[PDB]
Write an enzyme that holds these catalytic residues in place. Sequence first.
Site, PDB file in Angstrom:
ATOM      1  N   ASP A 334       0.964  -1.100  -0.059  1.00 17.87           N
ATOM      2  CA  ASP A 334       0.062   0.222   0.039  1.00 17.87           C
ATOM      3  C   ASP A 334       1.087   1.217   0.029  1.00 17.87           C
ATOM      4  O   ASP A 334       2.034   1.294  -0.812  1.00 17.87           O
ATOM      5  CB  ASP A 334      -0.700  -0.163   1.232  1.00 17.87           C
ATOM      6  CG  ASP A 334      -2.000   0.827   1.288  1.00 17.87           C
ATOM      7  OD1 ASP A 334      -3.048   0.911   0.517  1.00 17.87           O
ATOM      8  OD2 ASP A 334      -1.632   2.106   1.764  1.00 17.87           O
ATOM      9  N   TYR A 465      -1.594  11.052   2.428  1.00 16.76           N
ATOM     10  CA  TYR A 465      -2.341  11.430   1.036  1.00 16.76           C
ATOM     11  C   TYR A 465      -2.545  12.599   0.748  1.00 16.76           C
ATOM     12  O   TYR A 465      -3.215  12.892  -0.288  1.00 16.76           O
ATOM     13  CB  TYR A 465      -3.788  10.578   1.777  1.00 16.76           C
ATOM     14  CG  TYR A 465      -3.953   9.202   1.369  1.00 16.76           C
ATOM     15  CD1 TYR A 465      -3.954   8.708   0.081  1.00 16.76           C
ATOM     16  CD2 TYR A 465      -3.999   8.170   2.380  1.00 16.76           C
ATOM     17  CE1 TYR A 465      -4.424   7.577  -0.297  1.00 16.76           C
ATOM     18  CE2 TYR A 465      -4.066   6.907   2.026  1.00 16.76           C
ATOM     19  CZ  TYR A 465      -4.548   6.504   0.839  1.00 16.76           C
ATOM     20  OH  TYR A 465      -4.683   5.116   0.307  1.00 16.76           O
ATOM     21  N   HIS A 523      -7.380  -6.500   0.058  1.00 13.41           N
ATOM     22  CA  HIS A 523      -6.257  -5.643   0.263  1.00 13.41           C
ATOM     23  C   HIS A 523      -5.253  -5.683   1.380  1.00 13.41           C
ATOM     24  O   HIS A 523      -4.254  -5.343   1.357  1.00 13.41           O
ATOM     25  CB  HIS A 523      -6.909  -4.144   0.637  1.00 13.41           C
ATOM     26  CG  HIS A 523      -6.149  -2.913   0.796  1.00 13.41           C
ATOM     27  ND1 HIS A 523      -5.204  -2.549  -0.182  1.00 13.41           N
ATOM     28  CD2 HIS A 523      -5.326  -2.600   2.056  1.00 13.41           C
ATOM     29  CE1 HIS A 523      -4.181  -1.744   0.699  1.00 13.41           C
ATOM     30  NE2 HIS A 523      -4.581  -1.699   1.735  1.00 13.41           N
TER      31      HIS A 523
HETATM   32  F1  LIG Z   1     -10.151   2.894   4.108  1.00 17.82           F
HETATM   33  C1  LIG Z   1      -9.003   2.293   3.692  1.00 17.82           C
HETATM   34  F2  LIG Z   1      -8.218   2.339   4.776  1.00 17.82           F
HETATM   35  F3  LIG Z   1      -8.430   3.324   2.882  1.00 17.82           F
HETATM   36  C2  LIG Z   1      -9.189   0.986   2.980  1.00 17.82           C
HETATM   37  C3  LIG Z   1     -10.486   0.553   3.504  1.00 17.82           C
HETATM   38  C4  LIG Z   1     -10.729  -0.854   2.835  1.00 17.82           C
HETATM   39  C5  LIG Z   1      -9.812  -1.076   1.963  1.00 17.82           C
HETATM   40  N1  LIG Z   1      -8.617  -0.629   1.331  1.00 17.82           N
HETATM   41  C6  LIG Z   1      -8.502   0.755   1.897  1.00 17.82           C
HETATM   42  N2  LIG Z   1      -7.369   1.571   1.594  1.00 17.82           N
HETATM   43  C7  LIG Z   1      -6.136   1.424   2.436  1.00 17.82           C
HETATM   44  C8  LIG Z   1      -5.509   2.759   2.009  1.00 17.82           C
HETATM   45  N3  LIG Z   1      -4.942   2.804   0.634  1.00 17.82           N
HETATM   46  C9  LIG Z   1      -6.056   2.462  -0.322  1.00 17.82           C
HETATM   47  C10 LIG Z   1      -6.880   1.266  -0.008  1.00 17.82           C
END
Ligand SMILES: FC(F)(F)c1cccnc1N1CCNCC1
EC number: 3.3.2.10
Lengths: 546, 546
Positions: A334, A465, A523
């Site tokens: 990430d 971000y 993720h």
């Molecule tokens: F909310 C959340 F943390 F951003 C998030 C929530 C769920 C899936 N993926 C996420 N992201 C993590 C940060 N980078 C982009 C993807």
Amino acid sequence: TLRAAVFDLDGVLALPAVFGVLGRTEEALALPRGLLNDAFQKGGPEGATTRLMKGEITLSQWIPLMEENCRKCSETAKVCLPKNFSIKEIFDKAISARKINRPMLQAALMLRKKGFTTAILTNTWLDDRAERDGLAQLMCELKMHFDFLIESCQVGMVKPEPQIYKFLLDTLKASPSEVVFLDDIGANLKPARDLGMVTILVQDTDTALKELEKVTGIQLLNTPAPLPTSCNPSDMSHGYVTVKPRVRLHFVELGSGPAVCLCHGFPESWYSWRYQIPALAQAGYRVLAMDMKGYGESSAPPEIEEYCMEVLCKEMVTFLDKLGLSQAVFIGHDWGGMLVWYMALFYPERVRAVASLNTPFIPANPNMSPLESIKANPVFDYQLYFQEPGVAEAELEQNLSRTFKSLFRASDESVLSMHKVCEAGGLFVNSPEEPSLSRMVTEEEIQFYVQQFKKSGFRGPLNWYRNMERNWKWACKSLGRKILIPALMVTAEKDFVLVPQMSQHMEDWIPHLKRGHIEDCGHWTQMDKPTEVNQILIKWLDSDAR
Amino acid sequence: TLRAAVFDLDGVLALPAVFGVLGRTEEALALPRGLLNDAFQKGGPEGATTRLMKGEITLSQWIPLMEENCRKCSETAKVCLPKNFSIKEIFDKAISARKINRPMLQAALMLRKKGFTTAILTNTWLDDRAERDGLAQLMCELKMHFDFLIESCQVGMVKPEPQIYKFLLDTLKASPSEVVFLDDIGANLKPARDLGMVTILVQDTDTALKELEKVTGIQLLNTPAPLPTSCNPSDMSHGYVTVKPRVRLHFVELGSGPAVCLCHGFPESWYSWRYQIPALAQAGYRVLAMDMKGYGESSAPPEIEEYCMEVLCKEMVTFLDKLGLSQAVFIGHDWGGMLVWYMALFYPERVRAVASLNTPFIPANPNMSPLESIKANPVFDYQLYFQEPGVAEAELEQNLSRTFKSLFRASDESVLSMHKVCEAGGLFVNSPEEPSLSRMVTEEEIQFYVQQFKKSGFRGPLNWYRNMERNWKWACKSLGRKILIPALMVTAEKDFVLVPQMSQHMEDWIPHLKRGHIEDCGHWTQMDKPTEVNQILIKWLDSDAR
Ligand SMILES: FC(F)(F)c1cccnc1N1CCNCC1
Ligand SMILES: FC(F)(F)c1cccnc1N1CCNCC1
Ligand SMILES: [Mg+2]
Ligand SMILES: [Mg+2]
């Protein structure tokens, strides 16, 4: 009733057994049957071998005595030992041949997990051979899995002497009838049985486990594949490097060998690598699992620019400088994934190899402002939501347990889509007050994160971000380069934000890129599919970074 | 007037210069004079080389362009390049040939020490070759010595473009006339001179230093041999391992390669190794300099038994376990010296090699109580003084500055003898209130120790001396063993407590023991003779532990 399990090393937790090499060598060499076992035991209670096992002498002191013994045993058997007969040789080979008996270890693990107290009780020696590291490695890998390790040479007592079982029982704080004891040698079981301990005579592993299942009433055989070893935070070495006046970086450290720097994503922790940390160390690497700037025990300055990629990268280089590391392998996920691609492009001399989980490498578009790029893709909407300072901080900090319980979900469990988040008014507007616990995480584990985020909250994390433009400008400087050092991209089938297909043009910028791919993985890669992650990283480390 | 000094890398801080390999290769290969330099410069401001130096392209991207350039230069010169002509090859060889120009570095060091601000300004490249670690190591070893490192490929500007000297001046926070700039290329000096900076055209080092001496008014040439690099505590990586519930161990960590565990004596600190820490890391080792139990940022429990050798050793093994280290080289001094001999005898599988400074290995006498042994030797009288809890604590804690200023003395400076200390009523009864500062230590350095001992005082430290009997009993168990792993004993001529001759029978217990000996060196070995210590340990590491 049964509350403790005791395992031997040789022939129980590790196979082939070493006395086994006495029998094998005799056969390989056509010696009189038992000649080597006779020499190994010469003098019994007062012979060389017992003094070895009690720690009166070291292994190298013993080797010439065993030599003499073999000489005398063959004299009396009226044969000659072959030219080249070497006890050193036989023992070196046997000791490097012996490996952890995996199913026996997993059985011990399982029993410990249902609340058994576990112990290794072994007759063993002070090992001072040039090749001792081999044994030191084995014992290290085994002992961490047990409450106690009791070594004959450390306590000055040997099986089958009855005083060692009394020492055992005393160490266990248990009565004999609460104990199951496994051994491959029957004479060694007797004094346990005399005290009323349950005993298991281990010939083949599977039968021994069947007996052990029967007697503990716990399933050990045919159990599903267990997770990899995790980390307990308070058993780790915790490291701290000040990289500039207001910024100190924290990391956890395990293993020796080439340095491997683990960079977690948003909003995460060193602890997100808890499954890779022991596996990579066991595989021969020096693992440094960071808290990245903004998180955990690392500093979290408030200013946005403190978290643009350029500052973050220069800081990671300083961290190598202060640790005296000329390079490290960088592995990111990430945001940490994006950061390591930048380390590769701007500091290749410091990067032994680079790998990213989920995060693809996409070159900046010099003709299109990053904000515009971002508004093209409905799934990046969540990033616009993160821009206004305070807004996402307030939602994310409002209820930490609920935050991580909502975020950390396997691909079949989601409560939150990353879909029209701005319009909705935030990330959790349509998720429950008390989410169910994901299969990927225990309640204890959520509470670790909760406690880490109590120190600094989400300002630092969210700031990662908030430098779209500044990262875009710096990245533009790298548009003539390619990444030509070893590189691995690992895609996750069901990451609906960092989708596999977003990585599809990467070979243009990284011609020799290697790949792995994990199916049915959302993720949260490292904790979703920790087994597959470990196997893909170790294979790539061994071939490309070693 | 002059307040800053700026040095180039190639041909100033590191020699031979790489453009030098263009000239050499031409000559070695009988190519048209200058052909390779022409190809290196083809296109000047817009050619491949400038894009390299500005960081538009990496070194591996440049290699084929330079290849093309050489091809075109030879076409126009109507000759042929030899079969095997390889720019990769030439550049690999040249870059590994180039080494720190030691006298130039020591001059920079000296100027920095009289308060100059120093900088490296270099035209250099993003290096992504398989062999880049070579350069990464050089830059690491150099950069730590300077306030700034400015790299053309990182700032997107090259000498001789005037904007880089403006960037320089801005980084220095200095006006041009406060700056001396050294370079081996005259064209690169001009824009510095245009701004009114003092310039030095470096042909041979010595003449360049003569000019630099003249112009700064500081002696640089023919200076005495400087001390080795020391450590600044707040630039170190600080590590913390919990080895059991009330005991956490602190250590400083520098370098990569085989793990080397440094164990200080009484009453000392990780910081007592400040001179060996950078030298051993630079020599290719992973240095772990402990605060031993009782000291500094390590825990200091009050109970006497917490500091018997057995507990201390088991704790050091746990510390390797938690760091995931199967072995380390153990190097001790004074009490840490005694401890490593015990690690060798009781845990050889965990000890890659063992070395002691000053502390000899003497086997326990099973027929004579340790107290009696101690009362035989007038010079151990100080140990009887340490026995009664509180007495030595009160004297040592009364005035910390005075304590360390009295203890830390070179062999020609002593204020305290270890002679009839009990009878006198203590250690300092005949020493001054304010001792003079030893040559071995600055006031800043004393104050480091003072501040460390403010956390826990001398109870823990003194407890090391309060388990004569318990250590004696445990050591008796080891009387049949010998130490057969690699071992180094370093004696100090003028340590009047741990005298060289006390080590004279050691070959009986350690047949292959290696030795070093340091003349005119008192008890505080590492800080008394830091140069000789470094050289003896690195030589022994390289040959016995590597
Ligand atoms: F909310 C959340 F943390 F951003 C998030 C929530 C769920 C899936 N993926 C996420 N992201 C993590 C940060 N980078 C982009 C993807
Ligand atoms: F006072 C003092 F610290 F003990 C001491 C003072 C001076 C010289 N040597 C000393 N010793 C250090 C501890 N071990 C024995 C030698
Ligand atoms: Mg056995
Ligand atoms: Mg030059």
